[PDB]
Amino acid sequence: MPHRFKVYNYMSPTFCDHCGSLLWGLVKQGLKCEDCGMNVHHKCREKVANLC
Ligand SMILES: [Zn+2]
Ligand SMILES: [Zn+2]
């Protein structure tokens, strides 16, 4: 079943669960999955398997 990634405003340093690097930026720094909690960069969403 699919991740339901929604863009997210991270308020503490949070890292990408796919590539490990910081979700850089001030706002809108990546996407969180509603259902499993996975955090990804915009550039990393295509790279993650679509299995929630
Ligand atoms: Zn998920
Ligand atoms: Zn990443």
Numbering used by the authors: 229 to 280
Paper text:
Diacylglycerol (DAG) is a versatile lipid whose 1,2-sn-stereoisomer serves both as second messenger in signal transduction pathways that control vital cellular processes, and as metabolic precursor for downstream signaling lipids such as phosphatidic acid. Effector proteins translocate to available DAG pools in the membranes by using conserved homology 1 (C1) domains as DAG-sensing modules. PKCs define a central DAG-sensing node in intracellular phosphoinositide signaling pathways that regulate cell growth, differentiation, apoptosis, and motility.
The apo structure superimposes well onto the structures of DAG-complexed C1Bδ, with the notable exception of the Trp252 sidechain. In the DAG complex, this sidechain is oriented towards the DAG tethered to the membrane-binding region, whereas in the apo C1Bδ it is oriented away from that region.
